[PDB]
Scaffold this active site. Structure first.
Site, PDB file in Angstrom:
ATOM      1  N   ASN A 189      -7.720 -56.240  40.776  1.00 35.31           N
ATOM      2  CA  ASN A 189      -7.553 -56.827  41.591  1.00 35.31           C
ATOM      3  C   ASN A 189      -8.805 -58.169  41.119  1.00 35.31           C
ATOM      4  OD1 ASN A 189     -10.873 -57.724  42.531  1.00 35.31           O
ATOM      5  ND2 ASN A 189     -10.764 -55.687  41.073  1.00 35.31           N
ATOM      6  N   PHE A 201     -14.877 -62.752  45.054  1.00 40.34           N
ATOM      7  CA  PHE A 201     -16.454 -62.671  45.927  1.00 40.34           C
ATOM      8  C   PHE A 201     -15.495 -63.199  47.497  1.00 40.34           C
ATOM      9  CE2 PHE A 201     -20.041 -63.398  42.286  1.00 40.34           C
ATOM     10  CZ  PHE A 201     -19.476 -61.956  41.824  1.00 40.34           C
ATOM     11  N   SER A 211     -18.365 -60.077  37.034  1.00 40.78           N
ATOM     12  CA  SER A 211     -16.561 -60.670  37.719  1.00 40.78           C
ATOM     13  C   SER A 211     -15.889 -61.260  36.926  1.00 40.78           C
ATOM     14  CB  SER A 211     -16.558 -60.862  39.232  1.00 40.78           C
ATOM     15  OG  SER A 211     -15.813 -61.176  40.029  1.00 40.78           O
ATOM     16  N   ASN A 254     -13.064 -62.940  37.762  1.00 35.36           N
ATOM     17  CA  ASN A 254     -12.215 -63.565  39.378  1.00 35.36           C
ATOM     18  C   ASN A 254     -13.198 -64.550  39.913  1.00 35.36           C
ATOM     19  OD1 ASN A 254     -10.916 -61.749  39.173  1.00 35.36           O
ATOM     20  ND2 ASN A 254     -11.245 -60.197  41.081  1.00 35.36           N
ATOM     21  N   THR A 255     -14.383 -65.169  38.897  1.00 38.19           N
ATOM     22  CA  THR A 255     -15.289 -66.585  39.697  1.00 38.19           C
ATOM     23  C   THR A 255     -15.313 -66.995  38.672  1.00 38.19           C
ATOM     24  OG1 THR A 255     -16.412 -65.236  41.304  1.00 38.19           O
ATOM     25  CG2 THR A 255     -17.206 -67.283  40.519  1.00 38.19           C
ATOM     26  N   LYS A 283     -25.536 -56.246  35.511  1.00 37.53           N
ATOM     27  CA  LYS A 283     -24.169 -55.210  35.297  1.00 37.53           C
ATOM     28  C   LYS A 283     -22.886 -56.496  34.554  1.00 37.53           C
ATOM     29  CE  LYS A 283     -19.671 -53.487  38.390  1.00 37.53           C
ATOM     30  NZ  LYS A 283     -19.861 -53.172  39.567  1.00 37.53           N
ATOM     31  N   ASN A 301     -17.946 -53.584  34.455  1.00 37.06           N
ATOM     32  CA  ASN A 301     -16.849 -53.892  35.727  1.00 37.06           C
ATOM     33  C   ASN A 301     -15.605 -53.517  35.546  1.00 37.06           C
ATOM     34  OD1 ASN A 301     -16.286 -55.617  37.507  1.00 37.06           O
ATOM     35  ND2 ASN A 301     -17.969 -56.750  38.023  1.00 37.06           N
TER      36      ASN A 301
HETATM   37  C1  LIG Z   1     -10.961 -53.862  44.870  1.00 35.06           C
HETATM   38  C2  LIG Z   1     -12.616 -54.079  43.816  1.00 35.06           C
HETATM   39  C3  LIG Z   1     -13.189 -54.397  44.108  1.00 35.06           C
HETATM   40  C4  LIG Z   1     -14.300 -54.726  43.037  1.00 35.06           C
HETATM   41  N1  LIG Z   1     -15.517 -55.419  43.770  1.00 35.06           N
HETATM   42  C5  LIG Z   1     -16.166 -55.633  42.445  1.00 35.06           C
HETATM   43  C6  LIG Z   1     -17.623 -56.505  43.748  1.00 35.06           C
HETATM   44  O1  LIG Z   1     -17.783 -57.125  44.423  1.00 35.06           O
HETATM   45  N2  LIG Z   1     -18.801 -56.499  43.146  1.00 35.06           N
HETATM   46  C7  LIG Z   1     -19.389 -55.752  41.743  1.00 35.06           C
HETATM   47  O2  LIG Z   1     -20.016 -55.555  41.296  1.00 35.06           O
HETATM   48  N3  LIG Z   1     -18.182 -55.256  41.219  1.00 35.06           N
HETATM   49  C8  LIG Z   1     -16.805 -55.152  42.078  1.00 35.06           C
HETATM   50  N4  LIG Z   1     -16.060 -53.703  41.320  1.00 35.06           N
HETATM   51  C9  LIG Z   1     -16.060 -53.069  40.617  1.00 35.06           C
HETATM   52  C10 LIG Z   1     -16.104 -51.580  40.255  1.00 35.06           C
HETATM   53  O3  LIG Z   1     -17.673 -51.697  40.609  1.00 35.06           O
HETATM   54  C11 LIG Z   1     -16.469 -51.183  39.098  1.00 35.06           C
HETATM   55  O4  LIG Z   1     -17.205 -51.619  38.404  1.00 35.06           O
HETATM   56  C12 LIG Z   1     -14.604 -50.859  38.616  1.00 35.06           C
HETATM   57  O5  LIG Z   1     -14.058 -50.709  39.383  1.00 35.06           O
HETATM   58  C13 LIG Z   1     -14.775 -49.806  37.575  1.00 35.06           C
HETATM   59  O6  LIG Z   1     -14.763 -48.541  37.778  1.00 35.06           O
HETATM   60  P1  LIG Z   1     -13.715 -48.173  38.430  1.00 35.06           P
HETATM   61  O7  LIG Z   1     -12.411 -47.974  37.661  1.00 35.06           O
HETATM   62  O8  LIG Z   1     -14.522 -46.402  39.604  1.00 35.06           O
HETATM   63  O9  LIG Z   1     -12.992 -48.135  39.721  1.00 35.06           O
HETATM   64  C14 LIG Z   1     -14.278 -53.811  42.132  1.00 35.06           C
HETATM   65  C15 LIG Z   1     -13.727 -53.479  41.903  1.00 35.06           C
HETATM   66  C16 LIG Z   1     -12.476 -52.882  43.168  1.00 35.06           C
HETATM   67  C17 LIG Z   1     -11.663 -52.437  42.236  1.00 35.06           C
HETATM   68  O1  LIG Z   2     -14.682 -59.779  43.889  1.00 40.61           O
HETATM   69  C1  LIG Z   2     -13.684 -59.711  42.689  1.00 40.61           C
HETATM   70  O2  LIG Z   2     -12.756 -60.155  43.159  1.00 40.61           O
HETATM   71  C2  LIG Z   2     -14.260 -58.720  42.358  1.00 40.61           C
HETATM   72  C3  LIG Z   2     -15.725 -58.754  41.404  1.00 40.61           C
HETATM   73  C4  LIG Z   2     -16.312 -57.913  40.361  1.00 40.61           C
HETATM   74  O3  LIG Z   2     -17.491 -57.655  40.298  1.00 40.61           O
HETATM   75  N1  LIG Z   2     -15.335 -57.027  40.113  1.00 40.61           N
HETATM   76  C5  LIG Z   2     -14.179 -57.723  40.332  1.00 40.61           C
HETATM   77  O4  LIG Z   2     -12.953 -56.344  39.739  1.00 40.61           O
HETATM   78  N2  LIG Z   2     -13.478 -57.941  41.252  1.00 40.61           N
END
Ligand SMILES: Cc1cc2nc3c(=O)[nH]c(=O)nc-3n(C[C@H](O)[C@H](O)[C@H](O)COP(=O)(O)O)c2cc1C
Ligand SMILES: O=C(O)c1cc(=O)[nH]c(=O)[nH]1
Ligand SMILES: Cc1ncsc1C(=O)Nc1ccc2ccccc2c1
EC number: 1.3.5.2
Length: 365
Positions: A114, A118, A184, A186-187, A224, A253
């Site tokens: 992804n 944000f 993140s 992506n920023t 985080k 993350n």
């Molecule tokens: C589509 C998507 C959006 C995410 N957005 C955020 C986010 O806004 N802030 C954040 O701290 N982590 C974000 N994450 C990270 C998840 O919180 C998690 O740290 C990461 O995906 C690993 O866990 P998982 O393998 O169970 O998905 C995002 C992950 C995904 C897949």
């Molecule tokens: O908004 C995002 O794209 C985003 C934020 C984040 O903390 N982690 C991530 O995988 N994507």
């Protein structure tokens, strides 16, 4: 259960084949916010209960940030069986995030990439949404179902620290815990906030703002972190955390790495990778951070959890709580009860009285 297999074999793949990932997620959020969910069958036993961060958690399995970015589905998420919910990331001002498409499935790898960037309704909209159910949350928390709020920063922000400070002031009084998201991928420039000097400066300001909140509205503060840190970065983070009295860490993350062996056609898309290929990299980061903090700093472990074994490995590595997101994308809601049921069975098999006994057990071997 048959529900697990139905969602795993029939429902989710059909949803997948019909909708692009972003549309499927929006629909999932909508269904969740309306309680349109398969039967909430699993009953949490006492051995799943955990006390940490100044709170009782009825079970140690939470929903990771990113699923409910704007605080729209909190109650539906508890109904799905999560022992705690984290919303966000939320930025101070609304912002649209990156151009579409910006999320990709790697079914062959049970992974997601992804680059949302944000996308956020902003602090003010999320504040009002949380205020509308503030007292219901206060009862949920008392009942062992706490709420976390994850803070981000705007793309065009000059001062990162002020963005986070605003989040603390606005959403801090509505949260059981706050997350300073500095990981993140992506920023632009965000992950450099994990560096020692910037982090100490950022967190000092954050903690000052937090300490200025009235006592009943004063959340724990967690940081985080990324799975892609050097050993130097990790040692520095551990040192700052202990120097400032940070309440906990969320590990980890998504990864900007692309582990060898990825099969998905979309593996070379820009963004953070989540799911199965992230799992052991995350577990190893937890293991290192737990050791560097001497087991004294609570860790929420996240990254590729899709089973009780995955959860227990992170717990034994040092996590007091775990989260998942990506597993939901492939297995649907039944994965929550599945993880809890397998976790309980494994705890019994391995001679643990409960989850609490298992935290960091690997380090005592
Ligand atoms: C589509 C998507 C959006 C995410 N957005 C955020 C986010 O806004 N802030 C954040 O701290 N982590 C974000 N994450 C990270 C998840 O919180 C998690 O740290 C990461 O995906 C690993 O866990 P998982 O393998 O169970 O998905 C995002 C992950 C995904 C897949
Ligand atoms: O908004 C995002 O794209 C985003 C934020 C984040 O903390 N982690 C991530 O995988 N994507
Ligand atoms: C529409 C509907 N009606 C009864 S159950 C049900 C349903 O399965 N909804 C879903 C379906 C898939 C989901 C995936 C992730 C999160 C929540 C989800 C909710």
């Amino acid at each position: 259960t048959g529900d697990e297999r139905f969602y795993a074999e029939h429902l989710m793949p059909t949803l997948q084949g019909l909708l692009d990932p972003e549309s499927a997620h929006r629909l999932a959020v909508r269904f969740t916010s309306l309680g349109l969910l398969p039967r909430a069958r699993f009953q949490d036993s006492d051995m799943l209960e955990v006390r940490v961060l100044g709170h009782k958690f009825r079970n140690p399995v939470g929903i990771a940030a990113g699923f409910d970015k704007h605080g729209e589905a909190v109650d539906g998420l508890y109904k799905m069986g999560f022992g705690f919910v984290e919303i966000g990331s939320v930025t101070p001002k609304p912002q649209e995030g990156n151009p579409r498409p910006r999320v990709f499935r790697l079914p062959e790898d049970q992974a997601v990439i992804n680059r949302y960037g944000f996308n956020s309704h902003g602090l003010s909209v999320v504040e009002h949404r949380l205020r509308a159910r503030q007292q219901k949350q206060a009862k949920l928390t008392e009942d062992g179902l706490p709420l976390g709020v994850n803070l981000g920063k705007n793309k065009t922000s000059v001062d990162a620290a002020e963005d986070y400070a605003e989040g603390v002031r606005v959403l801090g009084p509505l949260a059981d815990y706050l997350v300073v998201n500095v990981s993140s991928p992506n920023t632009a420039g965000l992950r450099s906030l994990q560096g020692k000097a910037e982090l100490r400066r950022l967190l000092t300001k954050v903690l000052q703002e937090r300490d200025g909140l009235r006592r009943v509205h004063r959340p724990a503060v967690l940081v985080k972190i990324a799975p892609d840190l050097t050993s130097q970065d990790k040692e520095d983070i551990a040192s700052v955390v202990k120097e400032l009295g940070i309440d906990g860490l969320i590990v980890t993350n998504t990864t900007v790495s692309r582990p060898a062996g990825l099969q998905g056609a979309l593996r070379s898309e820009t963004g953070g990778l989540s799911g199965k290929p992230l799992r052991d990299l995350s577990t190893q980061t937890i293991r290192e951070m737990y050791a560097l903090t001497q087991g004294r700093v609570p860790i929420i472990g996240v990254g590729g959890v899709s089973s009780g074994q995955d959860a227990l490995e992170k717990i034994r590595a040092g996590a007091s709580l775990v989260q998942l997101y990506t597993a939901l994308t492939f297995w649907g809601p039944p994965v929550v009860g599945k993880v809890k049921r397998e976790l309980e069975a494994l705890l019994k098999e391995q001679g643990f009285g409960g989850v609490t006994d298992a935290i960091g057990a690997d380090h005592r071997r």
